Scaffold this motif. Structure first.
Motif, PDB file in Angstrom:
ATOM      1  N   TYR A   1     -15.524  15.145  13.615  1.00  0.00           N
ATOM      2  CA  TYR A   1     -16.048  16.327  14.283  1.00  0.00           C
ATOM      3  C   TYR A   1     -15.894  16.174  15.787  1.00  0.00           C
ATOM      4  N   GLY A   2     -15.344  17.200  16.433  1.00  0.00           N
ATOM      5  CA  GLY A   2     -15.224  17.211  17.877  1.00  0.00           C
ATOM      6  C   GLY A   2     -14.068  16.420  18.442  1.00  0.00           C
ATOM      7  N   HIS A   3     -13.176  15.909  17.598  1.00  0.00           N
ATOM      8  CA  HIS A   3     -12.051  15.126  18.083  1.00  0.00           C
ATOM      9  C   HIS A   3     -11.033  16.017  18.789  1.00  0.00           C
ATOM     10  N   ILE A   4     -10.167  15.379  19.576  1.00  0.00           N
ATOM     11  CA  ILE A   4      -9.107  16.100  20.269  1.00  0.00           C
ATOM     12  C   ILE A   4      -8.048  16.522  19.262  1.00  0.00           C
ATOM     13  N   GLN A   5      -7.681  17.801  19.296  1.00  0.00           N
ATOM     14  CA  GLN A   5      -6.748  18.347  18.318  1.00  0.00           C
ATOM     15  C   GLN A   5      -5.397  17.649  18.406  1.00  0.00           C
ATOM     16  N   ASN A   6      -4.772  17.451  17.242  1.00  0.00           N
ATOM     17  CA  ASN A   6      -3.466  16.799  17.126  1.00  0.00           C
ATOM     18  C   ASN A   6      -3.498  15.364  17.645  1.00  0.00           C
ATOM     19  N   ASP A   7      -4.663  14.723  17.575  1.00  0.00           N
ATOM     20  CA  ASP A   7      -4.827  13.341  18.012  1.00  0.00           C
ATOM     21  C   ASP A   7      -5.701  12.574  17.029  1.00  0.00           C
ATOM     22  N   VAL A   8      -5.465  12.768  15.734  1.00  0.00           N
ATOM     23  CA  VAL A   8      -6.274  12.155  14.688  1.00  0.00           C
ATOM     24  C   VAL A   8      -5.359  11.495  13.666  1.00  0.00           C
ATOM     25  N   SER A   9      -5.725  10.284  13.250  1.00  0.00           N
ATOM     26  CA  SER A   9      -5.041   9.573  12.182  1.00  0.00           C
ATOM     27  C   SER A   9      -6.083   8.867  11.328  1.00  0.00           C
ATOM     28  N   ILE A  10      -5.916   8.944  10.011  1.00  0.00           N
ATOM     29  CA  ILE A  10      -6.899   8.441   9.058  1.00  0.00           C
ATOM     30  C   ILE A  10      -6.231   7.414   8.156  1.00  0.00           C
ATOM     31  N   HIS A  11      -6.867   6.252   8.016  1.00  0.00           N
ATOM     32  CA  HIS A  11      -6.414   5.202   7.116  1.00  0.00           C
ATOM     33  C   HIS A  11      -7.603   4.661   6.337  1.00  0.00           C
ATOM     34  N   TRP A  12      -7.339   4.211   5.112  1.00  0.00           N
ATOM     35  CA  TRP A  12      -8.381   3.773   4.194  1.00  0.00           C
ATOM     36  C   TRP A  12      -8.144   2.324   3.795  1.00  0.00           C
ATOM     37  N   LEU A  13      -9.211   1.528   3.806  1.00  0.00           N
ATOM     38  CA  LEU A  13      -9.165   0.132   3.393  1.00  0.00           C
ATOM     39  C   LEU A  13     -10.354  -0.173   2.495  1.00  0.00           C
ATOM     40  N   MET A  14     -10.123  -0.997   1.476  1.00  0.00           N
ATOM     41  CA  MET A  14     -11.168  -1.440   0.562  1.00  0.00           C
ATOM     42  C   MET A  14     -11.292  -2.954   0.656  1.00  0.00           C
ATOM     43  N   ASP A  15     -12.521  -3.437   0.843  1.00  0.00           N
ATOM     44  CA  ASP A  15     -12.791  -4.865   1.024  1.00  0.00           C
ATOM     45  C   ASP A  15     -11.961  -5.442   2.168  1.00  0.00           C
ATOM     46  N   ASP A  16     -11.822  -4.655   3.237  1.00  0.00           N
ATOM     47  CA  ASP A  16     -11.095  -5.052   4.445  1.00  0.00           C
ATOM     48  C   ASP A  16      -9.623  -5.350   4.163  1.00  0.00           C
ATOM     49  N   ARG A  17      -9.085  -4.803   3.074  1.00  0.00           N
ATOM     50  CA  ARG A  17      -7.660  -4.880   2.787  1.00  0.00           C
ATOM     51  C   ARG A  17      -7.127  -3.469   2.582  1.00  0.00           C
ATOM     52  N   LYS A  18      -5.940  -3.211   3.122  1.00  0.00           N
ATOM     53  CA  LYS A  18      -5.408  -1.860   3.165  1.00  0.00           C
ATOM     54  C   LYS A  18      -4.925  -1.411   1.786  1.00  0.00           C
ATOM     55  N   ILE A  19      -4.961  -0.097   1.574  1.00  0.00           N
ATOM     56  CA  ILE A  19      -4.407   0.542   0.386  1.00  0.00           C
ATOM     57  C   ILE A  19      -3.428   1.607   0.864  1.00  0.00           C
ATOM     58  N   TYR A  20      -2.240   1.643   0.262  1.00  0.00           N
ATOM     59  CA  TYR A  20      -1.207   2.584   0.678  1.00  0.00           C
ATOM     60  C   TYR A  20      -1.154   3.826  -0.203  1.00  0.00           C
ATOM     61  N   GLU A  21      -1.342   3.667  -1.514  1.00  0.00           N
ATOM     62  CA  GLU A  21      -1.276   4.788  -2.453  1.00  0.00           C
ATOM     63  C   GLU A  21      -2.597   5.562  -2.452  1.00  0.00           C
ATOM     64  N   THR A  22      -2.968   6.037  -1.262  1.00  0.00           N
ATOM     65  CA  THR A  22      -4.222   6.763  -1.103  1.00  0.00           C
ATOM     66  C   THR A  22      -4.135   8.173  -1.677  1.00  0.00           C
ATOM     67  N   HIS A  23      -2.994   8.841  -1.494  1.00  0.00           N
ATOM     68  CA  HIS A  23      -2.812  10.243  -1.866  1.00  0.00           C
ATOM     69  C   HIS A  23      -3.907  11.111  -1.235  1.00  0.00           C
ATOM     70  N   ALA A  24      -3.981  11.011   0.088  1.00  0.00           N
ATOM     71  CA  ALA A  24      -4.960  11.732   0.884  1.00  0.00           C
ATOM     72  C   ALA A  24      -4.473  13.144   1.182  1.00  0.00           C
ATOM     73  N   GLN A  25      -5.427  14.020   1.499  1.00  0.00           N
ATOM     74  CA  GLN A  25      -5.155  15.423   1.812  1.00  0.00           C
ATOM     75  C   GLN A  25      -5.843  15.745   3.137  1.00  0.00           C
ATOM     76  N   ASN A  26      -5.091  15.659   4.231  1.00  0.00           N
ATOM     77  CA  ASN A  26      -5.623  15.937   5.564  1.00  0.00           C
ATOM     78  C   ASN A  26      -5.687  17.445   5.756  1.00  0.00           C
ATOM     79  N   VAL A  27      -6.892  18.002   5.666  1.00  0.00           N
ATOM     80  CA  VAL A  27      -7.118  19.437   5.794  1.00  0.00           C
ATOM     81  C   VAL A  27      -7.981  19.671   7.026  1.00  0.00           C
ATOM     82  N   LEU A  28      -7.502  20.519   7.931  1.00  0.00           N
ATOM     83  CA  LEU A  28      -8.276  20.876   9.109  1.00  0.00           C
ATOM     84  C   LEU A  28      -9.373  21.868   8.741  1.00  0.00           C
TER      85      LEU A  28
END
Ligand SMILES: *[C@@H]1O[C@H](CO)[C@@H](O[C@@H]2O[C@H](CO)[C@@H](O[C@@H]3O[C@H](CO)[C@@H](O)[C@H](O)[C@@H]3O)[C@H](O)[C@H]2NC(C)=O)[C@H](O)[C@H]1NC(C)=O
Ligand SMILES: *[C@@H]1O[C@H](CO)[C@@H](O[C@@H]2O[C@H](CO)[C@@H](O[C@@H]3O[C@H](CO)[C@@H](O)[C@H](O)[C@@H]3O)[C@H](O)[C@H]2NC(C)=O)[C@H](O)[C@H]1NC(C)=O
Ligand SMILES: CC(C)CCC[C@@H](C)[C@H]1CC[C@H]2[C@@H]3CC=C4C[C@@H](OC(=O)CCC(=O)O)CC[C@]4(C)[C@H]3CC[C@]12C
Ligand SMILES: *[C@@H]1O[C@H](CO)[C@@H](O[C@@H]2O[C@H](CO)[C@@H](O)[C@H](O)[C@H]2NC(C)=O)[C@H](O)[C@H]1NC(C)=O
Ligand SMILES: *[C@@H]1O[C@H](CO)[C@@H](O)[C@H](O)[C@H]1NC(C)=O
Ligand SMILES: *[C@@H]1O[C@H](CO)[C@@H](O)[C@H](O)[C@H]1NC(C)=O
Ligand SMILES: *[C@@H]1O[C@H](CO)[C@@H](O)[C@H](O)[C@H]1NC(C)=O
Ligand SMILES: *[C@@H]1O[C@H](CO)[C@@H](O)[C@H](O)[C@H]1NC(C)=O
Ligand SMILES: *[C@@H]1O[C@H](CO)[C@@H](O)[C@H](O)[C@H]1NC(C)=O
Lengths: 212, 316, 37, 158, 320, 34
Positions: B28-55
């Motif tokens: 909320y309130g972030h600068i537009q077109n300046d956002v990136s989201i990544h997900w990690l479980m147990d401090d280890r990264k996951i690539y097959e997130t299949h995320a849906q970035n919806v504004l």
């Protein structure tokens, strides 16, 4: 040689429907066939193996069991009790000799888990455990005679079990002591005949007395 | 700018089989077109997130987007720590969620009791109580107390008791400072044990809401009453919160708490919470006729200093 | 225990002996009475 | 000896009836009270062979036809009651062997009994042992009576 | 006019030991509704939540469609109880639901049975007492039978039975057995048993009247407090020294009953040192304008140990 | 209890023995005079 001994190898005299119980004759780790005679409810069964394995106990599997190994004597009877309840207080024995040992449990219906179990003796709690496990009472004395029951928690509901009575005695009761009363009961009958024979004899003897 | 990164998630729906839990990373309130989201479980990264970035919405430079993560039920019930990495203006932001730990390991119940108003505002020696019930045994149980601002805590007194149901309880009492409680300090009571997979953590703070001072009225013994005993009643109403202390007096002399009763507070009509209680003290005719006066004083946190309000009742 | 059972056996044998002797006396007195008839 | 032989005849005929009735009483009480499926068939050899019943019946029948030959003295009574005595003597002879075998079995069982009241088995075996002893005494008495009676009835046809 | 269904989501935050607030926040997102034609209501186990003042926030507007959400704050103790929280979305007379719980295991929660006695009002005033056997926490209502059996007589009445489906995916069964007032008074013991093919034994609950030494209640009525001059008036009714605790209190207003939602009664408190006596306070607050209408209020109470016709009423009026 | 019953039974036996002796001697003396 000596008498045979029959022992279940779950050591519980009270079980629920569906429990597995194996009955063992004189005792070894082998299902030796055509070597044991089994009597249940005063009726010989078709089982002839050294082990009588019941995979699913039923209400009709209760009663009295006697085994007689080949070349030995008949065994002392053992009683099995099969029931259906919500909570059942299992016990290893119902009569214990002095300096004896017996276990108890609080078991539920068909692998349901009991939690927060409290064990009561004569309406006085003496132990509490989160899980339902053994409560071994070793070196029994006269203080360990009374009515036992447990109140645990089912899935989330409190339930109460029926009271079970365990007695500690110096020696077992032999259940046939009245048989020795036949001999005194027969003497009074024979002595009563003697008194009756006096009256007849005295009356007949008095008949000659009056004649003279 | 500091975006308000908060992590929300779904949970079990009792009306459906529901073999999936969804993770959301709202920015909320972030600068537009300046956002990136990544997900990690147990401090280890996951690539097959299949995320849906919806504004969501845009307000000038400020904007709001979110992401969706679809994890299985077993990945959630494993109590792994899921974290969201937000890349805004070169800075890095974090937000963590876990399945909350069981609050009753081995069936152990823990209560955290707040200080009484009498100690807080009259005696000046408040205390927090941590009652641990349903213990198989006292051994190896440790209790720790944590403050919020300072690392200096007092000494806590601990006692054990075996009840009639063959269960042990532990009571740890920590003396607290009235002022720090007044400002709204938080305190924890962490119970620990080797057989506990996770420690038991309980927190307490001053009750939140809108305060309101109580009104107290005293009634004479009923005119229909001319029997052996005489009854005096005290009516306290229109107060918030539920914490109140009531004590009776007889010619400026305290009466033991076993000589009078008090009712459990009842909520009144809402929607703002209000309570009322009734206090009853029954005395014999001979005691009532000894030419004295009685008092009914209450202590509350919504009253002006010295937070005491008293009402006297007498036949004269 | 065993002593009381021994006493019971003694009593049973005593009863047997007594009833046998009383039967003998009865038959003798009956024979005499029919003889007097 | 013939004058003595007359008076004893009636009394021995009487005592046979008593022996038979006591045998019947023992048989009845053993059959009714005991649950025979819990005990061995070699301890209960006395009752498993039915000795009390066919012993009591024959003893009572012999007694009834020995207390009639001294009251009516009919020609069909004598030579009509000696067959009721030969069979009685045979039954008494077999009963002694049966009781001796049962006593041997009882001793063999009681070998493995640390006490008389260890359990139901040892107690019941001891009770059966003393019952068998009493039955053996009564059987010896009845056999002696029958043998004397046969001697009397065969001495006058010599 | 067609009905446009919206999408309803129920998200929330997570617990944090390291924090001190000890609260959980719930969000009920609704997208694609119609402007100024929505209403979000919160429930907790079929019980409406009033004392929370849930906050309603608008997200955006897209032509005729718009999106809003409502936030709710609950405590950690409420969340840990595994209670279902529902948000009800109302749009153009239609209701759309969304439920949430705490992710837990598949333990087969047991069945709880409650047996309640008839109220004294029906026993001694209405004349139609009834019993109720409330059965809760059933996965489904099938194969469940409830039977009533008495102790003295054998003529039982027709017991009507009803079922209900709840928001927490559980079913409840209630059966009502109308009985005779006199038979209840004399000391009969009824019981209710519930049976299922999977139950090892039926669940049995028994009820009789409360045993003890009866005591007739004494009632007093107090005028509004003298120090009160505000826009409201409070009328209280002290009932004490009665046994058993089963009592009925109703306020009358010019011989016209007042609904039970306008007055509140405290739970009975035992006293008198094992003499088994109780006392309650009944409070009715009416506004100043309503009180100033020269009425004549009444505090009528029905108790078992009272003399016939088993009612006691006290009259309070401003004139006297 | 079993000793007590043995006591009464032995008393009965003694009484019967004494009575038998008396009756026997009486009948013997009566037959002697005959
Ligand atoms: C074994 O017996 C003990 C004592 O009889 C039981 O402990 C009692 O448990 C209840 C509820 O768990 C406690 O009541 C609670 O009190 C707190 C503090 O006032 C209150 O905030 C709660 O709402 C609740 O009313 C009660 O205090 C406690 N007794 C003592 C002396 O602390 C225990 O539950 C029994 N265990 C079993 C397995 O039956
Ligand atoms: C699912 O939701 C239903 C509806 O809220 C829950 O039913 C409620 O359960 C409670 C206790 O389990 C009942 O309270 C009891 O009420 C009786 C009747 O007055 C009273 O005598 C007892 O002392 C107790 O307070 C409540 O009445 C009942 N509500 C209804 C409408 O039946 C149910 O427990 C929930 N189940 C789960 C697993 O969440
Ligand atoms: C039942 C068991 C416990 C006791 C068995 C002994 C007695 C009850 C019975 C069995 C044999 C019966 C005896 C068999 C036949 C006789 C012959 C009878 O002699 C006479 O006929 C005398 C004439 C007369 O006075 O009647 C005397 C009774 C007596 C001993 C009977 C007495 C009662 C006896 C002893
Ligand atoms: C063996 O005997 C026992 C009794 O000692 C029988 O157990 C009973 O079984 C009936 C069902 O037929 C139940 O109604 C009773 O409650 C049981 N009694 C007890 C004490 O549990 C058993 O059925 C018999 N089994 C056989 C094969 O005859
Ligand atoms: C528990 O009891 C069972 C049956 O009595 C026995 O086989 C087992 O060894 C016991 N175990 C313990 C740990 O006591
Ligand atoms: C058995 O109970 C009695 C009764 O209180 C008590 O005096 C005695 O000490 C107990 N036995 C033992 C071994 O403690
Ligand atoms: C995201 O998870 C939901 C869970 O119901 C699922 O329906 C959906 O297909 C998933 N989407 C992707 C892209 O994996
Ligand atoms: C819920 O708690 C948060 C954090 O204290 C607060 O900002 C918010 O206003 C609360 N919501 C309500 C409806 O009180
Ligand atoms: C339940 O009832 C239905 C019909 O009422 C019947 O078909 C079924 O067999 C019963 N039992 C189960 C387990 O469904």
């Amino acid at each position: 040689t000596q008498k045979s001994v029959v022992s279940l190898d779950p050591p519980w005299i009270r079980i629920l429907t569906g429990d597995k119980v194996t009955l063992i004759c004189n005792g070894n780790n082998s299902s030796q066939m055509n070597s044991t005679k089994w009597i249940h409810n005063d009726s010989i069964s078709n089982v002839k193996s050294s082990h009588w394995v019941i995979v699913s106990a039923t209400i009709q599997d209760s009663g009295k069991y006697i085994c007689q190994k080949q070349g030995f004597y008949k065994s002392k009877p053992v009683y099995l009790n099969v029931m259906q309840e919500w909570l059942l207080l299992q016990s290893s024995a119902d009569v214990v000799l002095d300096n004896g040992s017996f276990d108890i449990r609080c078991r539920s219906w068909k692998k349901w888990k009991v939690h927060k179990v409290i064990y009561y003796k004569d309406d006085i709690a003496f132990k509490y455990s989160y899980d339902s496990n053994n409560i071994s009472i070793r070196k029994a004395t006269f203080n360990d005679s009374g009515s036992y029951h447990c109140t645990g928690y089912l899935n989330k509901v409190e339930c109460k079990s029926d009271k079970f009575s365990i007695a500690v005695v110096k020696d077992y009761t032999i259940e046939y002591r009245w048989l020795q009363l036949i001999f005194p009961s027969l003497a009074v009958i024979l002595f009563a005949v003697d008194t009756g024979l006096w009256f007849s004899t005295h009356k007949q003897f008095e008949s000659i007395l009056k004649i003279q | 700018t500091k975006p308000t990164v908060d992590l929300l998630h779904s949970s079990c729906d009792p009306n459906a089989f529901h073999s999936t839990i969804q993770l959301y990373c709202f920015v909320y309130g972030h600068i537009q077109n300046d956002v990136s989201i990544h997900w990690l479980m147990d401090d280890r990264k996951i690539y097959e997130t299949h995320a849906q970035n919806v504004l969501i919405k845009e307000e000038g430079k400020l904007a709001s987007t979110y992401s969706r993560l679809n994890i299985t039920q077993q990945q959630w019930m494993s109590e792994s720590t899921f974290t969201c990495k937000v890349t805004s203006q070169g800075e890095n932001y974090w937000a963590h969620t876990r399945r909350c730990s069981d609050d009753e390991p081995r069936g152990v119940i823990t209560y955290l009791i707040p200080p009484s108003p009498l100690d807080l505002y009259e005696n000046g020696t408040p205390k927090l109580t941590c009652l641990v019930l349903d213990l198989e045994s006292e051994e190896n149980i440790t209790v720790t107390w944590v403050r919020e601002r300072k690392k200096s805590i007092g000494s806590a007194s601990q006692r054990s008791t075996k009840h009639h149901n063959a269960t042990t309880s532990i009571t740890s009492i920590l003396p607290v400072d009235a002022k720090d409680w007044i400002e709204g300090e938080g305190y924890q009571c962490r119970v620990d044990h080797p057989h506990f997979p996770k420690p038991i953590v309980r927190s307490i703070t001053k009750a939140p809401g809108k305060r309101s001072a109580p009104e107290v009225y005293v009634f004479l013994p009923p005119e229909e009453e001319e029997k052996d005993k005489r009854t005096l009643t005290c009516l306290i109403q229109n107060f918030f919160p539920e914490d109140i202390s009531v004590q009776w007096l007889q010619d400026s002399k305290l009466i033991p708490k076993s000589q009078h009763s008090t009712t459990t507070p009842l909520k009144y009509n809402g929607s703002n919470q209000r309570f009322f209680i009734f206090s009853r003290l029954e005395v014999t005719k001979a005691l009532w006729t000894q030419t004295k006066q009685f008092t009914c004083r209450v202590i509350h946190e919504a009253l002006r200093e010295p937070r005491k309000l008293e009402r006297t009742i007498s036949k004269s | 225990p065993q002593l009381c059972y021994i006493l019971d056996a003694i009593l049973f044998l005593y009863g047997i002996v007594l009833t046998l002797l009383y039967c003998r006396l009865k038959i003798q007195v009956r024979k005499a009475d029919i003889a007097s008839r | 000896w013939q004058s003595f032989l007359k008076k004893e005849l009636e009394f021995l005929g009487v005592t046979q009836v008593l022996v038979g009735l006591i045998c019947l009483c023992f048989g009845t009480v053993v059959c009714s009270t005991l649950q025979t499926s819990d005990f061995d068939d070699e301890v209960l050899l006395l009752y498993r062979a039915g000795y009390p019943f066919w012993g009591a019946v024959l003893f009572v029948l012999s007694g009834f036809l020995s207390i009639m030959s001294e009251r009516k003295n009919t020609l069909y009574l004598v030579r009509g009651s000696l067959g009721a005595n030969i069979v009685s003597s045979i039954a008494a002879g077999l009963g002694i062997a049966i009781l001796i075998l049962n006593l041997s079995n009882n001793s063999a069982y009681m070998n493995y009994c640390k006490d008389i009241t260890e359990d139901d088995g040892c107690f019941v075996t001891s009770f059966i042992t003393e019952l068998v002893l009493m039955l053996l005494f009564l059987t010896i008495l009845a056999f002696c009576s029958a043998v004397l009676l046969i001697i009397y009835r065969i001495g006058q046809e010599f």
